[PDB]
Amino acid sequence: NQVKVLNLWASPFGLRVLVGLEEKGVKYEYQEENLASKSELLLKMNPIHKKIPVLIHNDKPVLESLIIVEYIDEAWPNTNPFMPSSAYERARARFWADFVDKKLYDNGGALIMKCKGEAQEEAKRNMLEYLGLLEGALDELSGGIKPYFGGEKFGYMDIAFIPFASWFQAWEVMGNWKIPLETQFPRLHEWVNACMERESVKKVLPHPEKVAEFAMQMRRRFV
Amino acid sequence: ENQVKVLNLWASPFGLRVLVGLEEKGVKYEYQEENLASKSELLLKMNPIHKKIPVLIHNDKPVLESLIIVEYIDEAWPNTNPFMPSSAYERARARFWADFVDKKLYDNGGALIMKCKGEAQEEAKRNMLEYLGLLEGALDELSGGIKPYFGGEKFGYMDIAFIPFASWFQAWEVMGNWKIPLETQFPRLHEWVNACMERESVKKVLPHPEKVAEFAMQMRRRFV
Ligand SMILES: N[C@@H](CCC(=O)N[C@@H](CS)C(=O)NCC(=O)O)C(=O)O
Numbered sequence: 001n002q003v004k005v006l007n008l009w010a011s012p013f014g015l016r017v018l019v020g021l022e023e024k025g026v027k028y029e030y031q032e033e034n035l036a037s038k039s040e041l042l043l044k045m046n047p048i049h050k051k052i053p054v055l056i057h058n059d060k061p062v063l064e065s066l067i068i069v070e071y072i073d074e075a076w077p078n079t080n081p082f083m084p085s086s087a088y089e090r091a092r093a094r095f096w097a098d099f100v101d102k103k104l105y106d107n108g109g110a111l112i113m114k115c116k117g118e119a120q121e122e123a124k125r126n127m128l129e130y131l132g133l134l135e136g137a138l139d140e141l142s143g144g145i146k147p148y149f150g151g152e153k154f155g156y157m158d159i160a161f162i163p164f165a166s167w168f169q170a171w172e173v174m175g176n177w178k179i180p181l182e183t184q185f186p187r188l189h190e191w192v193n194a195c196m197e198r199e200s201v202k203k204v205l206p207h208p209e210k211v212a213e214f215a216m217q218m219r220r221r222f223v
Numbered sequence: 224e225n226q227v228k229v230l231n232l233w234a235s236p237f238g239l240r241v242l243v244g245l246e247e248k249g250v251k252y253e254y255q256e257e258n259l260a261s262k263s264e265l266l267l268k269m270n271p272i273h274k275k276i277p278v279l280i281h282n283d284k285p286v287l288e289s290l291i292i293v294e295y296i297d298e299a300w301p302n303t304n305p306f307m308p309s310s311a312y313e314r315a316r317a318r319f320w321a322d323f324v325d326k327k328l329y330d331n332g333g334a335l336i337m338k339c340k341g342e343a344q345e346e347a348k349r350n351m352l353e354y355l356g357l358l359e360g361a362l363d364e365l366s367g368g369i370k371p372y373f374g375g376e377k378f379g380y381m382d383i384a385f386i387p388f389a390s391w392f393q394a395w396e397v398m399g400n401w402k403i404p405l406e407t408q409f410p411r412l413h414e415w416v417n418a419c420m421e422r423e424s425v426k427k428v429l430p431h432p433e434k435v436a437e438f439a440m441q442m443r444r445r446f447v
Pocket residue numbers: 008011012013014035049050051052053064065066
């Protein structure tokens with residue numbers, strides 16, 4: 001087949017790509033990579049970053065997950081629109097996906113993984129602040145409409161964010177705490193539960209327990 | 224009393240992107256210079272999470288993050304000067320190379336030439352040459368050999384994304400006490416810069432490299 005995906009099973013960034021592929025109804029090859037022993041294929045396709053995910057479409061590589069998502073939407077444009085119609089809402093969608101990566105993850109969950117003590121508590125403070133902002137972002141982009149970031153339509157932003165729900169338990173485990181979604185962030189809770197009813201998400205999103213084990217394994221490398 | 228307002232710092236390549244893009248589309252706009260030491264409440268109302276420039280306000284709508292702003296500008300005035308390519312893949316690659324300009328050439332190149340000393344700075348310049356090599360390649364990749372732009376004959380997203388750093392070359396040369404061998408080792412980029420500088424947009428908004436250099440040196444002294 002014309003389409004291949006190189007990924008790490010627990011990576012939210014490639015899970016974006018899989019979810020996106022399924023939503024468009026694309027059949028694809030999947031190759032699991034060991035980042036400790038990377039395929040020459042990955043190095044040939046992503047020599048600059050040497051990172052997953054990689055999407056190979058007709059042996060041409062698409063790199064960096066959000067761009068890949070936009071690529072998928074633009075490469076399979078006849079159905080299932082990820083992007084909004086208006087420019088500004090698209091700008092906001094991009095802004096918020098970017099925000100998910102740079103803040104909720106890079107300046108949140110990653111530090112929960114890597115950090116210890118007051119640093120970790122600070123990471124958790126940050127995570128709550130960001131999830132608050134994202135709870136607000138949901139009502140912003142949805143226009144109050146339920147239950148997705150695209151209201152009734154499951155879109156770019158839903159795709160960018162929902163794989164991190166597979167990481168919540170991991171974050172809870174490594175920070176030894178409880179994330180109060182149901183109470184402090186109910187829209188996101190409902191949204192996750194809603195997203196979990198879709199075929200795509202059920203097909204590709206892994207069990208949180210496994211991710212958590214995996215995350216702990218990775219935490220030991222740090223701390 | 225016009226509908227587009229830009230909040231910016233004059234020397235930032237990232238806001239210069241925005242200005243260049245607006246000039247290409249023929250959009251008339253207000254410009255507001257921000258002091259990052261005393262930020263306007265407006266900048267804070269409009270960009271409360273990052274509190275950064277540039278900010279583009281279009282009819283009370285704040286557009287944030289320079290590349291996204293560039294895309295917004297293209298998508299909001301689409302009947303005029305298309306920035307983005309026709310093919311999805313080339314758009315994917317253009318966006319990729321833009322991200323590459325920000326995260327590599329700058330964050331892991333020029334920023335470090337400003338911030339660092341010794342072996343670190345030396346390695347930053349080594350990197351800059353590597354990245355500029357890759358970008359010399361990027362131009363031919365995306366242009367299809369066609370000259371003189373990243374869009375061949377059309378002046379686009381990546382051209383806009385990259386060309387404000389040309390005002391920063393001289394500054395990097397000074398802060399690193401070296402010369403970037405554009406004319407010899409990256410001649411496409413040389414040709415491309417000179418071509419882009421023939422456009423009114425770029426001529427209109429891009430500052431003299433000398434003042435950029437002074438400014439860069441001052442802040443380097445703040446970093447020593
Ligand atoms: N910038 C990439 C980030 C991808 C990424 O770094 N994923 C992690 C998952 S933790 C990874 O495995 N990176 C490859 C590596 O370890 O070098 C994107 O937007 O998708």
